[PDB]
Write a protein that binds this ligand. Structure first.
Ligand SMILES: Nc1nc2c(ncn2[C@@H]2O[C@H](COP(=O)(O)OP(=O)(O)OP(=O)(O)O)[C@@H](O)[C@H]2O)c(=O)[nH]1
Ligand SMILES: Nc1nc2c(ncn2[C@@H]2O[C@H](COP(=O)(O)OP(=O)(O)OP(=O)(O)O)[C@@H](O)[C@H]2O)c(=O)[nH]1
Ligand SMILES: Nc1nc2c(ncn2[C@@H]2O[C@H](COP(=O)(O)OP(=O)(O)O)[C@@H](O)[C@H]2O)c(=O)[nH]1
Ligand SMILES: [Mg+2]
Ligand SMILES: [Mg+2]
Ligand SMILES: [Zn+2]
Lengths: 34, 430, 275, 442, 442
């Protein structure tokens, strides 16, 4: 589902600045406790 | 020498949108904000109205306030809307209802702190701050209430600067709003204490300008707001371009106001030429002067023939001789000597600026201080007394919380202003 | 209590070292508070349990044991200390305490009156008024019990129950009444999303008694006036509010708590029709 | 931005069908609630939001409730063409009617049904961020429309407070009549309506029948024609919220400009280019002609003649290709007329509005297609004559207590008749007093 | 991490079947105890550990006991579809029922069976390393559920001590009823339950019938629907142990936050998006809408109205795609309402939890599929009315000694009736007194 978003994220390689990327936790697949 | 603009209410936001279109055109600023102009004369004073954002861009020093965002959504959707800073739009969640007390007391106190924060942020960014400029109507609700509220707060915070207003006033023939006399009287009461100089415009005069002088077949509010934006951008022209006789807003105020209550002025702009007659009249300083004094070209309903000029000012743009300006002002003062107050030896100030507006060889804007303005206030006071004696719509204002004593103060102050004008009209040397 | 566990000493090097360095120790006496450039600070800790007299014994033992003792201080666990110095140098057995210092001396002295004034009102509040099970403390009983209609519904409309929509015991519904637009004292206008404020939705009974005719019909009982128990509740005659829908006055009891306000007006002396 | 519509009883639901048909066709929502996928405009417009909300899958659903005591009409809506558009909770139906008894609606049955309605309206009001009023459609001639409409407006007025409530109301026609007991229900409704409504617009079927006979070429009109005219009026008044224009008018502006004193809130309504397609090609339709049209009494939707009174305020809404200068010239010419008189305490008599969106054309409709239209609502003392005639009818019957036992059996004190009749008498005296010139009283 | 479930009598076993169906389908254990691990996750998983244990051959077996005095329902479980899932020792059944007598269960028959139950629970608790409470399912209206549930909770409370015990309890509904002697058994149960439970959640079948008619579109519901709703609630509360999340909530947090005084441990429960597929597709279901839903009394699974009392504490569990800012905005909106009241001694009224795993959909189920849900348990003084009506029915029967000879014959002193009735009277006075404002007490 979220493949092309990850592709763009890997291509761009933006730095870690507050307010740049948000909501990456909501895109996970499993959420099971490992 | 930087000006800060405030646009309030529907009329104010629309006129502001047209003003910033005109200003961006004169300085060659693309609607993306990039400078694309063709002379250094444009760049060297761009700071006066624009702040510089990074890698090229310019942003306009204006605050937009309204109680419902509908007009703002229209201006943001317009062709130049992108230029405006998003943080500069301040809005509530319910309208003013054309009610002065609501606009001043209930949503006013709710929003006003965010407006003062934006206005202070904008003012303190200037390296040297010149006066404020405000556009609003006096007959409306948020225009009247929030304009006078903000003016009072800015006069508390910046008492040494200039306060300038452009204001729309109710036509003598047809009302646009039923409760206009109350809102007008209370707003004029606020202005005469707080303001330094106020210009008044009747929409009826702009309609007659368009139909008789420009002979437009299908005029729209864009044309009226373009005429207003033209004069507004013209008054400040000497602030921001070189010239043979520089002038400044404070110099206009110092030459126009003889006594501190007498600060209400008539406005006009001269080079309006009819849609099919340009072949019949060449541009010249006499032609501009002739249009300049024709009452057809004045944007208020009162006529000079029932009063006398205390003072007047003319600002000329273009390459022209100073001799022609001085001798024209002498000839007009000498030939019409009965219409000029005799205990002042010269009523007209002139100023000359080198750079005309694009596509015009020459232009002048005219500001006049005339006692015939007393007739408008008398009419408004009559209509107020008719409504107030019968409590015609008073329960809205009293239910919001207003003391009735406020209405009697505003009526008394306006009546004294009319009396003072009448006394200075009939004064004599003896 | 002040439990002292620390002590520090300020000592000069041995006399041989002073002679080698080139300092005349005979001029160690001075009338100023500055110290000799060769003096150094060394500190030791006491045991996990000790007394003030133990610290004095350690200080005096240090005074006897080494030459060049200039001064010493005993540091308490509250942050204060007391300084020890010989009256006449080059003459031991004259040690005494000259003064004491704590970091909160002027700090506490400046703020004493406001502290006492606030404490005198704080202490009556902290007294418990209920027992372990939350019952009455043998006094100050309320005039009426909690579940009575006029006590439970002092300032709130009672429920209305109807059989519509239920094939069993009916249940009430929630309303859209908003409380007064009251903000916390001094907390900035902090907000997480666009919310429906209480500046709007002002009740229509704000000034109906002086800018209108008041109540003209008997329909006030359908939505505004309720009969609760042996009393009458009117939603238009409650706590006073201003034009922006915020309360005007606050009433406090003798103990200092905040009153709630009552919409109950009158007592209805109901009698069964009998003759 | 948002407005919530409340439809009550038979007339209100049937007028609702025409209204929501029109708002769908004007915005472009399909009957199943999905925008067409063939269009590639590229832009993602939101103007519908005033009347529709989106779930997120892109279905549209409307901000309305339908309230009735008999099932048949709501079940017809449930089984009709717009079945999939409405959420089933919005369509509320009782078991049995209020049988032309105001008392049955107000005391016995509507008191049971009203809490479901209030819960649905609350659920609507929670899904808003700039609610700016309630629109209510009902008739005061029938039992459930009068009794439950009054009770529900009363509860709304306590719960929501200052928020505005605008009513569209069908009053009993001066010689067309449908039930014997109409005067009692209309008087008792009107007693509640004085306190609990901000503006009330009055309609009479006899006027819309006359207008459809004279202007349109319809020999045998029926209620669907009247309901389409009403829908056009509502669309004209709410267009100011939804489309670009020169002079917008918020719903709060009506109460401020039209109501001088808190009881004087009943206004007359009329609409100008009601014209047939065959007439439309013989005539131009300029601004000044339709402005002259709105003032003829043949144009009114209530059977009253404004020449028998004095105007206090007028509100003129123009939509379409109009320029302000023509509106100003027209209004000044109207002001010149000798059969139009304003009370001397109201010198500035007019409010104007100008919107650019022209009126929409409905595939089955009977109005011609026109580039511009104007709609007026106005407050005038002539209105006192309608109440006076409803009073004589009430007095003639009440002199013999002709039907009162029904009302008393269904829960009403006999005293309530006399109270309401005295309040309407005082309203008549109010209209006499407000219209007296100040120059006469010195 | 681990929790042990104890199911008692008929309601508790039938609710257990739905619970274990759900926990199997959510974790992925086959009905024969296996896990077809097909994911390419690289490392193993542990979420099952709370409810299942592995032998080593990879079969799963669950941490539960089923206790009954009649064989039929447990033999039905033994012969059903899940035969191979449960260990046969876990399914314990006696020969004959407690015949709606609490005294028969407590004194005569449960006393024989109780030691087997404790030996099984001990054998489970020895195969744990972080047990953090017991979940108990029973009905207080019947004989074995009341008598053996009380006796077993007493023994557990002595043997295990401090470990928490959270009860989900089906109380006798206020006018639907199934047996005559329900008040006596419910009073005596509540007397034993007061000392030996940490939080008690109350359920009424009449409320879940109303909820399934009103929210779902089921004309003829049966116990499987109610049991599936209960299973969803328990899964929502225990999800915080089992899946990753922003703000976890351990089972010990409930007792600390919900119980102000040691007798005041009875809580109300509600669940928000109980919705049918057609309604679910007519509406968006945002955080604020479901937060508004959990406070309506129409959403509750116990027949009490919280508008007749004051809230003392609320615990809100959000699961699924929710963001904390929306939770804060919702709770602040709830706090704004005037018809929602908290006792003035409880200013900080709320506890929040936020978990990322959305609720599972069961193939035969009647609930829609939804991206988010919220579940609430709350303590309110309105609960005093449930005891008052049970006590009134007890007083009516005991005033005439209506059935006492059965209870005295099966082993109980008559004195126990008066003791229990006086304890419930004191509980009523506690709920009356705690609700008294502080400003009145000075
Ligand atoms: N214009 C118009 N008038 C209508 C319509 N339907 C009914 N009326 C009129 O309204 C009056 C009847 O009111 P109803 O709506 O039938 O009354 P009700 O709300 O159903 O009240 P109950 O009979 O008790 O159920 C009569 O004067 C009808 O002529 C309609 O669709 N359009
Ligand atoms: N919700 C729900 N209620 C149930 C269920 N089974 C029984 N009840 C209700 O619980 C009460 C009966 O309690 P039972 O569980 O039958 O009593 P018992 O535990 O079997 O006690 P004995 O009869 O002595 O064996 C009645 O109110 C039933 O309506 C169920 O599966 N689900
Ligand atoms: N010249 C001009 N006048 C306007 C414009 N918009 C409104 N007006 C006039 O201003 C008055 C209405 O005031 P308004 O702006 O609506 O007040 P507000 O409701 O407080 O914003 C009327 O006299 C209108 O004719 C405009 O764009 N240009
Ligand atoms: Mg009907
Ligand atoms: Mg059984
Ligand atoms: Zn009523």
């Amino acid at each position: 589902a979220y493949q092309q978003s990850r592709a763009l994220k890997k291509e761009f390689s933006l730095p870690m600045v507050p307010g740049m990327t948000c909501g990456e936790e909501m895109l996970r697949r499993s959420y099971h406790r490992t | 020498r930087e000006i800060v603009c405030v646009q309030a209410g529907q009329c104010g936001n629309q006129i502001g949108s047209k003003f910033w279109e005109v200003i961006s055109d004169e300085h060659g600023v693309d609607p993306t904000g990039t400078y694309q102009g063709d002379s250094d004369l444009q760049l060297e004073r761009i700071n006066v109205y624009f702040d510089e954002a990074t890698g090229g861009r310019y942003v306009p020093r204006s605050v937009l306030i309204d109680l419902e965002p509908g007009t703002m959504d229209s201006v943001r959707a317009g062709p130049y809307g992108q230029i405006f800073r998003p943080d500069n739009f301040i809005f509530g969640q319910s309208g003013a209802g054309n009610n002065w007390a609501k606009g001043h007391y209930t949503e006013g106190a709710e929003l006003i702190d965010s407006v003062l924060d934006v206005c202070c942020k904008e003012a303190e960014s200037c390296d040297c701050l010149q006066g404020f400029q405000i556009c609003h109507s006096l007959g409306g609700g948020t225009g009247s209430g929030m304009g006078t509220l903000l003016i009072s707060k800015l006069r508390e915070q910046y008492p040494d600067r200039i306060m300038m207003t452009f204001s729309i006033i109710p036509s003598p023939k047809v009302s646009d709003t039923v409760v206009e006399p109350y809102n007008t009287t209370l707003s004029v009461h606020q202005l005469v204490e707080n303001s330094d100089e106020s210009m008044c415009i009747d929409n009826e005069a702009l309609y007659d300008i368009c139909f008789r002088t420009l002979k437009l077949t299908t005029p729209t509010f864009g044309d009226l707001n373009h005429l207003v934006s033209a004069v507004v951008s013209g008054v400040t022209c000497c602030l921001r371009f070189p010239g043979q006789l520089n002038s400044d807003l404070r110099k206009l105020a110092v030459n126009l106001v003889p006594f501190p209550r007498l600060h209400f002025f008539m406005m006009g702009f001269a080079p309006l030429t009819s849609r099919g007659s340009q072949q019949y009249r060449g541009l010249s300083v006499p032609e501009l002067t002739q249009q300049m004094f024709d009452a057809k070209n004045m944007m208020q309903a009162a006529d000079p023939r029932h009063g006398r000029y205390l003072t007047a000012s003319a600002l000329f743009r273009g390459r022209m001789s100073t001799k022609e300006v001085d001798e024209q002002m002498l000839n007009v003062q000498n030939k019409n000597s009965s219409y000029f107050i005799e205990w002042i030896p010269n009523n007209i100030k002139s100023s000359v600026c080198d750079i005309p507006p694009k596509g015009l060889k020459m232009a002048v804007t005219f500001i006049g201080n005339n006692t015939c303005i007393q007739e408008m206030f008398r009419r408004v006071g009559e209509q107020f007394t008719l409504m107030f004696r019968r409590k015609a719509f008073l329960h809205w204002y009293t239910g919001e919380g207003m003391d009735e004593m406020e209405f009697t103060e505003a009526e008394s102050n306006m009546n004294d202003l009319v009396s003072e004008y009448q006394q200075y009209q009939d004064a004599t040397i003896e | 209590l002040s439990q002292p566990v620390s002590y520090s000493l300020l000592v000069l090097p041995p006399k041989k070292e002073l002679r080698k360095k080139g300092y005349n120790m005979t001029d160690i006496n001075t009338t100023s508070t500055r110290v000799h450039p060769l003096a150094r600070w060394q500190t030791h800790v006491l045991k996990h349990g000790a007394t003030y007299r133990d610290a004095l014994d350690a200080v005096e033992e240090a005074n006897t044991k080494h030459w060049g003792f200039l001064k010493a201080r005993i540091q308490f666990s509250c942050g204060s200390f007391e300084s020890f110095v010989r009256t006449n140098p080059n003459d031991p057995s004259t040690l005494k305490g000259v003064s004491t210092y704590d970091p909160n001396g002027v700090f506490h002295k400046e703020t004493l009156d406001c502290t006492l004034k606030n404490r005198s009102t704080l202490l009556p509040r902290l007294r418990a008024i209920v027992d372990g099970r939350g019952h009455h403390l043998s006094g100050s009983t309320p005039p009426a019990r909690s579940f009575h209609p006029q006590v439970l519904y002092k300032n709130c409309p009672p429920p209305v129950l109807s059989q519509a929509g239920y094939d069993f015991t009916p249940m009430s519904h929630n309303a859209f009444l908003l409380r007064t637009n009251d903000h916390p004292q001094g907390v900035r206008d902090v907000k997480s999303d666009f919310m429906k404020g209480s500046c709007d939705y002002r009740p229509r009974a704000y000034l109906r008694d002086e800018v209108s005719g008041g109540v003209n019909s008997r329909h006030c009982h359908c939505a505004e006036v309720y009969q609760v128990g042996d009393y009458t509740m009117d939603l238009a005659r409650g706590a006073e509010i201003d034009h922006r829908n915020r309360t005007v006055n606050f009433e406090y009891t003798k103990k200092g708590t905040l009153k709630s306000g009552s919409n109950i007006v009158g007592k209805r002396h109901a009698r069964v029709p009998r003759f | 931005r948002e407005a919530i519509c409340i439809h009550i009883g038979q007339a209100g639901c049937q007028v609702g069908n025409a209204c929501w048909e029109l708002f769908c066709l004007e915005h472009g929502i399909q009957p199943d609630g999905a925008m067409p996928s063939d269009k590639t405009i590229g832009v993602e417009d939101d103007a519908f939001n005033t009347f529709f909300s989106e779930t997120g899958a892109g279905k549209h659903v409307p901000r309305a409730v339908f309230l009735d005591l008999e099932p048949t009409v709501v079940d017809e809506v449930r089984t009709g063409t717009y079945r999939q558009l409405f959420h089933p909770e919005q369509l509320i139906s009782g078991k049995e009617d209020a049988a032309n008894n105001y008392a049955r609606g107000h005391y016995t049955i509507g008191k049971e049904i009203v809490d479901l309605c209030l819960d649905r309206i609350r659920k609507l009001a929670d899904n808003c961020t700039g609610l700016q009023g309630f629109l209510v459609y009902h008739a005061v001639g029938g039992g459930t429309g009068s009794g439950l409409g009054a009770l529900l407006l009363e509860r709304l007025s306590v719960d929501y407070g200052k928020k505005s409530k605008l009513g569209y109301t069908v009053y009993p026609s001066p010689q067309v009549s449908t039930a014997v007991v109409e005067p009692y229900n209309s008087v008792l409704s009107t007693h509640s309506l004085l306190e609990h409504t901000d503006v009330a617009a009055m309609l009479d079927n006899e006027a819309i029948y006359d207008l459809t006979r004279r202007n349109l070429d319809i020999e045998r009109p029926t209620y669907t024609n009247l309901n389409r005219l009403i829908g056009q009026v509502v669309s004209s008044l709410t267009a100011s919220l939804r489309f670009d224009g020169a002079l917008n008018v918020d719903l709060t502006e009506f109460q401020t400009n039209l109501v001088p004193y808190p009881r004087i809130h009943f206004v007359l309504t009329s609409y100008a280019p009601v014209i047939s397609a065959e007439k439309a090609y013989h005539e131009q339709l300029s601004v000044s002609e339709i402005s002259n049209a709105v003032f003829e009494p043949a144009s009114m939707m209530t059977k009253c003649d404004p020449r028998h009174g004095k105007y206090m305020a007028c509100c003129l809404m123009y939509r379409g290709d109009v320029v302000p200068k023509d509106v100003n010239a027209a209004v000044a010419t109207i002001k010149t007329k000798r059969t139009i008189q304003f009370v001397d305490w109201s010198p500035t008599g007019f409010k104007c509005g100008i919107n650019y969106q022209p009126p929409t054309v409905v595939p089955g409709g009977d109005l011609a297609k026109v580039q511009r239209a104007v709609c007026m609502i106005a407050n005038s003392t002539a209105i006192a004559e309608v109440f006076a005639r409803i009073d004589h009818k009430f007095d003639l019957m009440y002199s013999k207590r002709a039907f009162v036992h029904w009302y008393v059996g269904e829960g009403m004190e006999e005293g309530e008749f006399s109270e309401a009749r005295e309040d309407l008498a005082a309203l008549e005296k109010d209209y006499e007093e407000v219209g007296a010139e100040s120059a006469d009283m010195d």
